[PDB]
From a paper:
In R. marinus, ACIII is composed of seven subunits encoded by the Act gene cluster, six of which are conserved across species (ActA to ActF). ACIII is composed by a combination of proteins present in other respiratory complexes, which reinforces the modularity concept of energy transducing machines. Our structure shows that ACIII meets all requirements for an energy-transducing machine that couples quinol oxidation to translocation of protons across the membrane.
In this work, we describe a 3.9 Å cryo-EM structure of ACIII from R. marinus. ACIII is an L-shaped complex of ~130 Å by ~110 Å with a membrane domain and two peripheral domains facing opposite sides of the membrane. The structure shows that ACIII subunits are organized into two functional modules: (i) the electron transfer module, composed of subunits ActA, ActB, ActE, ActH, and one unidentified subunit and (ii) a module for membrane attachment, quinol-binding and ion translocation, comprising membrane subunits ActC, ActD, and ActF. Subunits ActA, ActB, and ActE in the large peripheral domain accommodate all the prosthetic groups in the complex, for a total of six hemes and four iron–sulfur clusters. The putative quinol-binding site is located at the periplasmic side of the membrane, in the first four-helix bundle of ActC, at a distance of 10–12 Å from cluster FeS1 in ActB. The location of the quinol pocket also agrees with the quinol-binding site of the homologous PsrC, identified by co-crystallization experiments, with a C-alpha RMSD at the periplasmic side of the first four-helix bundle of 1.446 Å. Heme I is more than 20 Å away from the putative quinol-binding pocket, suggesting that FeS1 is the primary electron acceptor from the quinol. Analysis of the ITC data revealed an ideal fitting by a 1:1 binding model and a binding constant (log Ka) of 6.5 ± 0.14, supporting our observation of a single quinol-binding site in ACIII. The observation of two likely proton pathways suggests the existence of two proton-pumping sites in ACIII. Interestingly, Glu122D is placed together with the conserved residues Ser245C and Tyr284F in a plane parallel to the membrane that coincides with the position at which the proton half-channels in ActC and ActF converge.
Residue numbers in the entry:
A (entry chain F): 35 to 416
B (entry chain D): 23 to 193
C (entry chain C): 18 to 462
D (entry chain A): 5 to 53
E (entry chain A): 160 to 211
F (entry chain B): 744 to 891
The structure:
């Protein structure tokens, strides 16, 4: 079926990648992070797409509204996929080792009075298990709603979605910041950067715009529809992919020029990442391939709105987040030897299939385009 | 004979009415109204898009080359300086000039085109002193024809006779 | 619907004409008195300055800057509001900005004027600033492009220009309208000859399509510049080695400060441009309602950064950056930061109560107070970590002189002086697109 | 209004172009305000010595 | 500064330097650079030289 | 500060307060992001009659106590003006060589001051943030560590 092929091939591949958790152990936990958080950024990005669609309300991109909402209930499934981190969590973050604060080791890493309150691995349990009570609660309060305004239309149809956006809104941006400050800030904790809570955010809402976009571009050609969602719908998605590629590269470069300048001890993210060990290769071929080829190819409005291109971009626009995030997650291990392993990729094509398994099975579970909705024909007859 | 006028108070006619005449008859080089009658160039205005993005081509390149030449000529080769060990016009501190200074010299060319499409500075406008075009913004949403090869003859006045016009000046 | 007015396409022209028809206002004659008096106080102390020397401002050497550059970030951060509701609101195409837009790049461009004077004048050697420009000068010398103080120059010398040229182009249909009126009904027959800024306007098909894509262009081409102008003016801080600056979140932050500052002044102008000389039918109160969201967005995005600052002091800070923010709360400027953050956080989180508080008189008493924290935001962030930075030897309070304050005041003076000046000449409202967007301009009738 | 402002882009363009021509073919910045034959107290006359 | 970037167009062999009626020889330049290779003059390009 | 007892134990204690990193180089001569395009590896900083002799200026702080003549010869050799009470009150002084003193007690045990004096001229850096930042190129790492 349409729902089980990304799932059976991806979970067929994920169950194969059990070999990673068994063999070449410490490799697979962190190929799992670069994959796991990608699925989370996919959840994180396309959810914020729904939010901003409601705050400054936009009845022009609403045919591309129901489908992000499907993407969100991933994140509850992303809970039970937190497990492989936890067995390797004592092996990853380097503050879980607890032979370093003031035990008999030669190291008294200045973490005792500074960080140990914020980080203590039973606290890390709640610092994320708390987020499951929010980012899922948005699902059970939004996805339960927006799927339900179709069959059981309300007197107050959107303004309940606004209520999520009235108090469930800011907590999101907070928990994204502290999440990034808890997951990906901490691999090389000899580093202090305030922006990086947004590089994870923007680098998510960067991507998931593409996945939502390419899905229709796939589901327009030999899909269940072919002409309902008109071209100038995607014309806005381009205007978003530029307006958020800016909000990425502004951030990925403000992380760079600021730290390229000062040369501080916090720089040691990049004395090990950028220059050395086959990764100046990465950053160059990244940025040429991550900002300028999109910002150049999509630019002119004579093929910017065409479906199959922006669909072709969602591949080059989201497959690349592997290359964006493999510049953050894994290199603290292969700092010695830039030899990216087969296990680095099985979880990329795995979770990017497994998330999409659930994503179609829910679109198999119920409708695709909302059978009734405010301003639908206003966006369809456009 | 420089052209016609059509007092159309309808905001909507200019889509459907004027689309008749670009097909049936002549080209209608010039339609007149303040605001964008929406969905015009869908069929009416004869355009895939603006053309002068291809003329915005030379705006970005020269400015980009300007800054990038303002530093390969400046930071290393002619009067360099060991300011803070900065490696001689390494990209990043050049980005907010190789980006931003491009915007100025590339925008102004983006508007030099705008001031060049049929050469907007032509205050000489032998129709504009028409004694009733002077309520352009409010009265109606007008039409016009230069003396094209299908020359403005009584048939055109007869054509727009049934395209409901408050009046028909003939400059 | 997003404007409440019993209007047609014509009803605006008679009204905005009456706002530019005849020259006999009285409140003008008071504003041009007190404001120009403010400008007089400005130059009365600004050439008193340069003939004498910088130190009449209250600047010690550790805090070399004080209130002038603080006001530069203010009087440019205040201005991004105007250009971005011209650009952003077309990018998202909310079809909503039209009631206020043309009055906003004014509120930007004059801010940029009273801004740019500071980089020309908080220096001690003003006359030798053309060296900063990349002219091939009388020797083989050229500026240093690793310096954000230079990026500021090109940025503002481009941002004064792009925002102008995007405003001047924005107001072509006005000059068309006024050039059209000057003949048949208006000031004089010789206002038409003054309105050659119409530039042979006729509202034609051939170039109106181009006007749209250009307005699209500058929207998608001034926003990438706006996000670089104020970011440059933040890069100058955060590029440094200071702990209270080197924190990398600042360029998005100060930008949000520019939002949370600029709209915090536009509302001050719209309230007073709504009571006596107001447009009830075009400046709908529902507009200010949906206006304060994008303020209240940055009413919390500004707040999240304070948490990060206040957090990273506890997470992995240098033992100085640990102290750098304890200074901000606990120390000399406890009067500032406790109240400032609380001012910039209470009032926005006290703002959304009665459906965003549509009530007009609360807007003035709040929009001020929202902004006063901004002048503190840049007097705090800049200076509170510029003393008490990496030595006790460089510990010194900042005593601002009585000339620091008359320059601040004078910045309000020249702002109002020149904002009012062209505003009475140009039309306030973006009357071209107002009657073109929400009313029956749609061909579906 | 006026019929022959087709000539007006010329003086706008050309006089602006001449703005550049008059700028750079006029500079002589450290060649005009340098050279001079000052009157000494006595004339040494390096010629003769 | 044109000399401190392009010196060998100007410098004299030091034999009777104060000679106003001095036409230099042919093959002047290559006869000079052999001195900068040997004498090792290395003119200044910096701010430290004269401005302090 | 440090004792002869402690000094006898760890001669590498001037670094121990902020030592080098996990496995990375000693602190001076520590590479930046850039090492291949670093100006010391480019000619235009390296090509003069100066690079022969890099200049530096240590301070045997063990014999430095507030004689305060370290200043005054700077004031006369490399000229300055003075400053008035009415002016220095706002905190400006045109003495280049601060001779700042400091107190260190045992966490305020018996209020034993146990002062320290240490001069602090402009340690004319290599990485030198100040050099980078003058837009009007009034600073440069002149040859020989001089940052003039
Ligand atoms: C040739 C045409 C020259 C002109 C004109 C100027 N200078 Fe020169 N200078 C020249 C040479 C060949 C050398 C190098 C000699 C060596 O063996 O090193 C120099 C060197 C200097 C220095 C050296 C540094 C020092 O000893 O303090 C200085 C300060 C200097 N030159 C200054 C200087 C000034 C101020 C000039 C014009 C105003 C100038 N030079 C012109 C050759 C030539
Ligand atoms: C001689 C060895 C010099 C070197 C090397 C540099 N400068 Fe120069 N500069 C020099 C002179 C003799 C003059 C006077 C020219 C005049 O106008 O009469 C100058 C001029 C300047 C100026 C302008 C000062 C003015 O009054 O207009 C500046 C700002 C300047 N020089 C800066 C400068 C810098 C930054 C240099 C390297 C870092 C530099 N100069 C080299 C002599 C010499
Ligand atoms: S204070 Fe200066 S001059 Fe006095 S003893 Fe110390 S080093 Fe010498
Ligand atoms: S920045 Fe300049 S003055 Fe300051 S310590 Fe470094 S070299 Fe010395």
């Amino acid at each position: 079926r349409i729902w089980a092929v990304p799932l059976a091939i991806g979970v067929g591949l994920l169950i194969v990648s059990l070999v990673g958790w068994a063999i070449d152990a410490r490799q697979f936990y962190f190929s799992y992070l670069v994959g796991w958080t990608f699925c989370l950024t996919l959840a994180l990005g396309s959810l914020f797409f729904v939010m901003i669609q409601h705050l400054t309300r936009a009845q022009w991109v609403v045919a591309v509204r129901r489908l992000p909402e499907a993407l969100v209930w991933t994140f509850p499934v992303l809970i039970v996929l937190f497990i492989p981190i936890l067995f390797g969590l004592h092996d990853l973050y380097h503050w879980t080792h607890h032979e370093l604060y003031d035990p008999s080791s030669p190291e008294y890493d200045p973490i005792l009075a500074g960080k140990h309150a914020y980080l203590n691995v039973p606290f890390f349990l709640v610092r994320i298990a708390f987020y499951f009570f929010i980012w899922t609660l948005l699902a059970y309060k939004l996805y339960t709603l927006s799927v339900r305004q179709d069959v059981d239309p309300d007197p107050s149809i959107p303004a309940q979605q606004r209520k999520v956006s009235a108090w469930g809104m800011p907590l999101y941006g907070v928990t994204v910041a502290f999440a990034s400050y808890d997951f990906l800030m901490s691999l090389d904790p000899h580093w202090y950067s305030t922006i990086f809570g947004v590089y994870f955010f923007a680098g998510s809402f960067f991507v998931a715009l593409g996945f939502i976009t390419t899905c229709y571009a796939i589901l327009v050609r030999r899909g269940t529809l072919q002409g309902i969602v008109r071209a100038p719908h995607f014309q806005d998605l381009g205007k978003l992919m530029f307006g958020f590629t800016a909000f990425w590269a502004y951030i990925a470069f403000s992380q760079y020029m600021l730290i390229w300048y000062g040369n501080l001890p916090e720089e040691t993210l990049w004395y090990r990442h950028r220059l050395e060990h086959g990764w100046e290769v990465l950053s160059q071929v990244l940025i040429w391939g991550h900002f300028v080829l999109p910002f150049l190819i999509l630019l002119p409005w004579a093929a910017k709105r065409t479906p199959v291109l922006v669909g072709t971009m969602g591949i080059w626009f989201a497959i690349i987040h592997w290359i964006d995030l493999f510049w953050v997650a894994m290199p603290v291990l292969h700092t010695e030897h830039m030899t990216f392993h087969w296990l680095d990729v099985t979880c990329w094509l795995g979770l990017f299939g497994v998330v999409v398994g659930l994503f179609f099975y829910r679109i198999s579970r119920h409708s695709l385009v909302p059978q009734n909705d405010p301003y639908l024909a206003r966006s369809l007859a456009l | 004979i420089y052209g016609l006028l059509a007092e159309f108070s309808d905001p909507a006619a200019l889509l459907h009415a004027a689309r008749q005449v670009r097909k049936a008859g002549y080209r209608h080089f010039d339609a007149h109204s303040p605001f964008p009658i929406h969905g015009m160039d869908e069929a009416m205005g004869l355009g895939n898009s603006k053309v002068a993005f291809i003329t915005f081509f030379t705006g970005t390149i020269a400015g980009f080359a300007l800054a990038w030449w303002m530093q390969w000529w400046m930071g290393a080769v002619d009067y360099p300086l060991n300011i803070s060990g900065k490696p001689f016009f390494a990209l990043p501190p050049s980005v907010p000039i190789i980006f931003e200074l491009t915007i100025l010299f590339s925008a102004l060319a983006g508007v030099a085109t705008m001031l060049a499409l049929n050469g907007l500075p032509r205050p000489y406008n032998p129709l504009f002193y028409s004694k009733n075009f002077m309520r352009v913004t409010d009265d109606g949403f007008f039409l016009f024809v230069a003396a094209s090869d299908p020359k403005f003859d009584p048939t055109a006045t007869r054509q727009l006779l049934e395209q409901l016009g408050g009046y028909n000046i003939e400059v | 619907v997003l404007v409440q007015g019993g209007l047609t396409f014509h009803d605006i022209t008679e009204l905005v004409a009456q706002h530019t028809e005849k020259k006999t206002p009285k409140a003008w004659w008071a504003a041009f008195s007190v404001a120009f008096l403010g400008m007089l106080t400005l130059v009365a102390m600004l050439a008193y300055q340069v003939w004498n020397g910088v130190g009449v401002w209250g600047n010690n050497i550790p805090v070399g800057w004080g209130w002038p550059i603080v006001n530069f970030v203010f009087w440019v951060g205040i201005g991004h509001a105007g250009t971005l509701i011209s650009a952003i609101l077309f990018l998202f195409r909310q079809r909503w900005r039209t009631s206020i837009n043309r009055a906003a790049e004014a509120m930007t461009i004059f801010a940029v004027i009273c801004a740019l004077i500071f980089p020309t004048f908080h220096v001690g050697r003003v006359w030798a600033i053309y060296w900063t420009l990349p002219i091939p000068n009388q020797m083989e010398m050229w500026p240093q492009f690793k310096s954000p103080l230079l990026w500021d120059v090109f940025a503002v010398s481009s941002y004064f220009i792009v925002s102008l040229v995007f405003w001047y182009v924005g107001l072509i249909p006005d000059l068309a309208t006024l050039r059209d009126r000057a003949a048949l009904m208006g000031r004089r027959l010789r206002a038409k000859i003054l309105g050659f800024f119409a530039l042979g306007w006729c509202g034609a098909n051939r170039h109106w399509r181009n006007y749209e894509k250009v307005y699209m262009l500058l929207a998608g081409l001034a926003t990438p510049l706006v996000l670089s102008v104020h970011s440059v003016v933040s890069f100058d801080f955060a590029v440094s080695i200071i702990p209270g600056w080197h924190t990398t979140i600042f360029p998005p932050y100060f930008v949000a400060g520019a939002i949370f500052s600029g709209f915090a002044m536009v509302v001050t102008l719209m309230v007073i441009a709504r009571k006596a000389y107001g447009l009830e039918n075009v400046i709908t109160i529902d507009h200010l309602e949906k206006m304060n969201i994008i303020m209240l967005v940055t009413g919390t995005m500004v707040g999240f950064a304070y948490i990060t600052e206040f957090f990273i002091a506890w997470y992995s800070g240098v033992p100085y950056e640990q102290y750098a923010f304890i200074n901000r709360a606990t120390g000399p400027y406890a009067w500032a930061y406790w109240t400032m953050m609380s001012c910039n956080l209470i009032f926005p989180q006290f703002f959304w109560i009665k459906k965003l508080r549509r009530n007009i008189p609360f807007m003035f008493i709040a929009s001020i107070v929202v902004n006063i924290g901004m002048w503190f935001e840049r007097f705090v962030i800049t200076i509170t970590s510029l003393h008490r930075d990496y030595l006790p030897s460089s510990w010194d309070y900042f005593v601002p002189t009585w000339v620091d304050v008359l320059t601040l005041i004078g910045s309000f003076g020249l702002f109002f002086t020149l904002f009012l000046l062209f505003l009475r000449f140009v039309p306030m409202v973006a009357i071209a697109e107002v009657k073109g967007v929400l009313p029956e301009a749609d061909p579906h009738f | 209004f006026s019929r022959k402002t087709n000539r007006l882009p010329a003086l706008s363009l050309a006089g602006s172009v001449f703005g550049g021509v008059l700028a750079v073919f006029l500079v002589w910045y450290y060649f005009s305000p340098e050279f001079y034959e000052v009157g000494y107290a006595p004339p040494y006359s390096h010629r003769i010595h | 500064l044109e000399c401190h970037r392009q010196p060998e167009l100007y410098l004299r062999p030091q034999s009777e330097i104060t000679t106003m009626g001095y036409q230099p020889p042919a093959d002047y330049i290559e006869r000079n650079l052999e001195r900068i290779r040997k004498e090792g003059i290395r003119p200044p390009t910096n701010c430290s030289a004269c401005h302090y | 500060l440090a004792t002869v007892e402690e000094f006898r134990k760890n001669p590498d204690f001037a670094k121990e307060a902020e030592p080098p990193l996990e496995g990375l180089e000693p602190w001076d001569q520590y590479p930046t992001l850039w090492e291949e395009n670093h100006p010391s590896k480019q000619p235009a900083f390296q090509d003069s009659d100066y690079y022969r002799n890099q200049w530096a200026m240590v301070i045997d702080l063990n014999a430095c106590t507030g004689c305060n003549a370290c200043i005054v010869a700077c004031d006369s050799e490399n000229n300055i003006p003075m400053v008035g009470k009415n002016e220095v009150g706002r905190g400006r002084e045109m003495h280049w060589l601060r001779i700042d003193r400091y107190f260190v007690s045992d966490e305020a045990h018996a209020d034993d001051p146990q002062i320290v004096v240490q001069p602090v001229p402009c340690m004319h850096c290599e990485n030198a943030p100040c050099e980078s930042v003058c837009p009007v190129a009034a600073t440069v790492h002149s040859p020989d560590g001089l940052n003039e």
